[PDB]
Amino acid sequence: NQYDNDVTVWSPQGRIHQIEYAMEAVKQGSATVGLKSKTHAVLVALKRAQSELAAHQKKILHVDNHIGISIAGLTADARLLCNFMRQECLDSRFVFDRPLPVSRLVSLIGSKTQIPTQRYGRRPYGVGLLIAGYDDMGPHIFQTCPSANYFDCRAMSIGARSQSARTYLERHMSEFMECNLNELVKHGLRALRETLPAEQDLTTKNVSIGIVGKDLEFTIYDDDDVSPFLEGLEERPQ
Amino acid sequence: RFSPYVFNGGTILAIAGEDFAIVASDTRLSEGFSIHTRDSPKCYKLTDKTVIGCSGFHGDCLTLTKIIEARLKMYKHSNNKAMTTGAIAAMLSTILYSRRFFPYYVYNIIGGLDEEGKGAVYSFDPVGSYQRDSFKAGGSASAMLQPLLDNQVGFKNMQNVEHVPLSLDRAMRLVKDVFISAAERDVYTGDALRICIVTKEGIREETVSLRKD
Amino acid sequence: YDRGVNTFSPEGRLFQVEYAIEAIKLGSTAIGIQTSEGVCLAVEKRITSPLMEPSSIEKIVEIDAHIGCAMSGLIADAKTLIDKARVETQNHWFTYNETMTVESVTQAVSNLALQFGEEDSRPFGVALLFGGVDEKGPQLFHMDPSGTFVQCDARAIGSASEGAQSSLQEVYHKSMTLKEAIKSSLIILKQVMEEKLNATNIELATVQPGQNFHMFTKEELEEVIKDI
Amino acid sequence: DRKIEFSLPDLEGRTHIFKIHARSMSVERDIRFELLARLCPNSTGAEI
Amino acid sequence: QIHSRKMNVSPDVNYEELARCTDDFNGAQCKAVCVEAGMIALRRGATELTHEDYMEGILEVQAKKKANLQYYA
Amino acid sequence: SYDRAITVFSPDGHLFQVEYAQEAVKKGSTAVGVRGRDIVVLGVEKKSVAKLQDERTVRKICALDDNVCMAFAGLTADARIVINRARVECQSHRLTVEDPVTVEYITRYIASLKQRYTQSNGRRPFGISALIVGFDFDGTPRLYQTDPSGTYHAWKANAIGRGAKSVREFLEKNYTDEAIETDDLTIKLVIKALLEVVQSGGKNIELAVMRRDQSLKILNPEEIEKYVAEIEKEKEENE
Amino acid sequence: ERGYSFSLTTFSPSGKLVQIEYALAAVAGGAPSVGIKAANGVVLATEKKQKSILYDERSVHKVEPITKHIGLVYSGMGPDYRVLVHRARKLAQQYYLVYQEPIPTAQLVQRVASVMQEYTQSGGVRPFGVSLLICGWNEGRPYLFQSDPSGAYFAWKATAMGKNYVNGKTFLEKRYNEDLELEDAIHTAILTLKESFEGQMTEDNIEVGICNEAGFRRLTPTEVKDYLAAIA
Amino acid sequence: TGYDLSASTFSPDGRVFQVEYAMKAVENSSTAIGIRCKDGVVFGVEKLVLSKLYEEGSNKRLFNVDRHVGMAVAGLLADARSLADIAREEASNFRSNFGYNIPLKHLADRVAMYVHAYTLYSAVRPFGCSFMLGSYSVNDGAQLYMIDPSGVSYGYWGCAIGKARQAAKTEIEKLQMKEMTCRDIVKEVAKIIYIVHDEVKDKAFELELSWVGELTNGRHEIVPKDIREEAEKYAKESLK
């Protein structure tokens, strides 16, 4: 056709296919699930590699002492927004000498990414940022989109084959506001074990888990310290 | 007309130990002929293994401190590890030189450990030059403090002086005596002595009262 | 008939970046292997004429005494990235009085790797291997034209890349040594290159924890050839 | 209902096509086709 | 749900999940999911229908071009 | 500010403006260069004029320093501005590092300019190719060529221009070590080369030499007829 | 914002500038006018019909002065005229501030023509759609110049632009000589506007200005009724 | 075709299809209503619950521009909150330069000019948003302005945007806004959206109500919980 070339061009139905194609790379990235308790926020990522000698690509990135994110898309734009994210933490920490409110940060992210979605010859950002953080109001789990329409939630999932993880979260979401970390994390592992082929699940080098805690700095756990969390789970029913 | 500089007093001191380092300073912020406060420490825990002291113009001490605290996190987010002591000195030399034509009115001494558990003291001019020394006094009464440490620590001008390395307790009573001896003559010497100690285990603090003229 | 330079696919990715992924298939193939003893590295030259001087071309080029590089595909664009790598490492040493780590070099180039637009023009047609000995011992990284980089252990990039990976997974293991890794590489190169192998079709360079970056020349090179 | 794609062969489809169009001609025995399929990244079976 | 009537279907299915993970379709494409899931089970020689059969039928009805894309995330 | 990308990727991985510019090179006049062990020599063919007017202005061989000579092919207008910027750069080397410029350095300057010149916005790439000949410090004579993509590339001998692949086949089919024995024998090789590619061996040739310590020297059209005369004499007794 | 920064005017494969070719046709669809110099000054005359009686002909004007001694008319479209009118009004002042002397008419035509050719090449603009006639008695001798949308210029004894100018140039060819007067050029200028005018020719269907050694000025409908009086 | 790509090209019958296409995306946004009573303005926003995994209070389609000026939107959320940012900054320009609070007739004029600015060029697109503005003054009463995608504003005794726009405004004129104070306005504003977006088209909704007047002491805020619990008590009087 011809309504499928530029960001400025509206569809006759009013649905811009450039943004609709920017919603594809977030479906092309690997799956990950975020969630929160009353007092703790946990997000669990699923690594990928290309050859078995090649290392697995990380997804969980440390932003601040109370802010951590996950990605799904291209790593270049992931780092491009990430450096802006670190910058917007440390400058206001420099000015007001205080941590930064997460919703106020994400509003700045949406205002940041809305701008190239309206000019000419300007792509949107292909990324799927799940955001975990603390205000004074405890845990907050946010998700983004290339259409710059950020969504508050209590648990979400993005990446390839995430709908099954959503179906797991809907029938267990009532439990989540009481249980603490040692079973909350493996609830998230029961989310990520769903989205897999039926033979391989959790082989201790393909997974990472990040936690911000009510008196605990945001900590990334990778291919080792995962093994205390990873044990004590049931076998996959078949 | 409008002057941009003023002198806030203060006097800091660092001594490199064998497997430790001791950074100490008084806690008086004041200028003119008056006292602003009797509580203003100059100890600053940068890492677990690095403590900086900052004397001179107080607003530049605050600003420079916060800029350093930013650039550590910039390094760590860049490199997934912490800075080392010589890396901090090598950075802050460039930071001080970066305002060559409008300098900070700040004296600085960095105390801390190496990668091998040894004391390291780096003293700064207000422009950005430095060296690694065993012990440096900075501030107002540094002229009162340096030759005493040259005699006791450096063993200078003594005949048949043996050379025991400095024990930690001897260093402690050395500092606690010498700040009293400076306090009896300098007007800028404060009323309480914040002492910070960097070991292989962590950071210890201790505060000793002084006279309060 | 003519889209923009910044147009997304209906499949979702882009067009020109994926075209640059197509573009690097034509380059001369290159193989590097990460080994705890040290990182070895090799490439052919694709010699055309007898009148052509062989040693004027290269794909091995160093960045520091502990960082070497290897390129593929288009060549004339790569020298810009080599220059930015060198300037970047000298900035990091100039400001911190230490060595910039290999991964941080790799993301320093990979941030530059995707910056074309219509303000202030196209992606790059290269494919890079980074051999380095940091404080974590030997390292080996491979980046993309899309700025995506990852650590490998034995990566083969070029025209015969998928064949050499298939012949390479079968021979790599976690406990290699350097002398067997070099000959193990040259067996694969002998399998995949066109012309008869000599002391001038290829060139190698290694890096060690002890000594600095080193490149082989036509005296210490042909012993592996006669001992293939 | 069905929307079968026809793309270019990756490597092995090309080598197989060399085995198809090259089986019935007098050739030197010890040649290899894999080098030629390395030399033809983007090509059709008509071109092969 | 209508066109899934005359097929051997194991009660594994979640039409809310399928319809929620399938936007932008019509009755022809939604029927086409039912027939392609009706074929892949015969490809594996199964007798009833499972959820992942529908999940692959989604991919075939979408009918994407495959080009070597795993280097994301 | 005309901000527009020109050099874009093909759907199969090509740069159309680059490979068209190499065709614009491929229609240019033929220039051949070799190197001797002690005296380098090169010459353009196809002077092709009306043979009744001026000609010093059409001389397609210039110097950059005392030790660096340079010829080219392709369209004439884009060449001389590259010559100008190369002269400014090679002077600026002497404003820096005190030695004269090495030919490898100045060719990296030219190719490095040309590549980013393709990388820039709103610019067609250059449509020239050059041969750059210099006997450096410590007297090691060498030469290079310049692709319009900007790939500097060493040779023992080369030939670009319209009808150059057959000339290159003659050069590989004729180049020995004893062909570079005498300097006039090397000139007889070059005049043997152009002659069997430029057909009619009249005044179309324009040769220029360098004895690795001098400046450039262009022979007047007397040794053209003399060397061509003894060339036809040697071929005459050879037949 | 910013413009397009590319010329929308290219050479044809026949080697023609097609937008200039169309702009000349748009000039040819303009209102007819003519101008004559004869031995004491230049007479310009145009043809101005209101579309109905509701307009005020005393509001706008075709005959426009540029300085003390230079007037200017056109034959083309309306809103493109006033822009370069105002530009030329400026250009005489930038001459006069430098030299403290009124501008030579030729030196004005240089700069106006350079404005038009400068305007027909730059990015993202259509060329102008008028042709001008410029008068003035500088250093005694009168002068009459004619521009074009392409930016060229000429020195006419007498010519005509607008519609039926191919007939008007034949009529002025059969009419004019070297030796006339200003009022004679008035009378044959009315006589050549009557070649292609409408049914009635009143005191306001036209607009006539003249140059002298006294300088440029513009006529009123009183003496325009006196000149159209006892005419034809 | 080809006449409906840029925002710089007229149609061969003389209009712009880009502005109309951007207007069409407004009728995919759900429903936004708001009327001004006898002594205040009440905005009413119904909010579709997409999935259960969202948290209550997310992604609010109802904004707060000034202390007294409020905004309710219906369009695309990022562009809507972008317009909330520039209007929110614009009131700060007015108070910062002039020293008092901005009137609606000036404010909606400024915002409407800024929206109209993106209706001309091939570089930018039109907004896919429309929204409502209203506030209360003690010197000027209450106001109610609405802004289309094209950048045209009007005063209203009541207005409505969303999917069921005519099925909203058909029932607003049954009320008597000229005399009712903003108390039973809450129940009526509640009921007129209670009678729309049925359980066929919607899974479940969420009520979101804004509220301003001198009963709110001029300042703009949300409704209290108990009052909209009385509105939800007034919900199930539609079954009869």
Side-chain angles (χ1 to χ4, degrees), chain A residues 25 28-30 48 50 57 59 71-73 75 161 163-164 167 171, chain E residues 14 16-18 20-21 24 51-52 55-56 59 69-73:
Chain A
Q28 294 296 322
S30 64
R48 290 184 292 176
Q50 294 180 356
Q57 181 64 43
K59 294 190 291 187
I71 53 96
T75 63
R161 191 183 292 274
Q163 189 61 256
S164 66
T167 61
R171 64 176 64 88
Chain E
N14 189 359
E16 292 83 1
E17 179 180 1
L18 294 173
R20 190 172 64 249
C21 73
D24 203 2
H51 181 77
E52 67 275 16
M55 294 301 293
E56 295 182 356
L59 296 174
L69 192 145
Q70 293 179 355
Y71 63 98
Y72 282 178

Side-chain angles (χ1 to χ4, degrees), chain C residues 5 16 19 22 49 51-53 56-57 76-77 80 118-119 121-124, chain F residues 3-5 7-11 115 119-121 149-150 153-155 175:
Chain C
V5 300
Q16 290 179 353
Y19 291 163
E22 184 65 29
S49 174
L51 301 174
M52 184 184 73
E53 202 280 329
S56 66
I57 61 169
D77 50 353
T80 302
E118 292 293 327
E119 288 85 5
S121 66
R122 65 178 174 87
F124 291 159
Chain F
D3 293 332
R4 183 182 175 90
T7 304
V8 299
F9 286 94
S10 75
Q115 190 275 127
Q119 187 55 250
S120 176
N121 287 313
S149 65
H153 197 78
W155 291 88
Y175 184 78

Side-chain angles (χ1 to χ4, degrees), chain F residues 1-4, chain G residues 2 4-6:
Chain F
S1 66
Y2 182 70
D3 293 332
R4 183 182 175 90
Chain G
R2 62 106 184 87
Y4 285 163
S5 297
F6 63 93

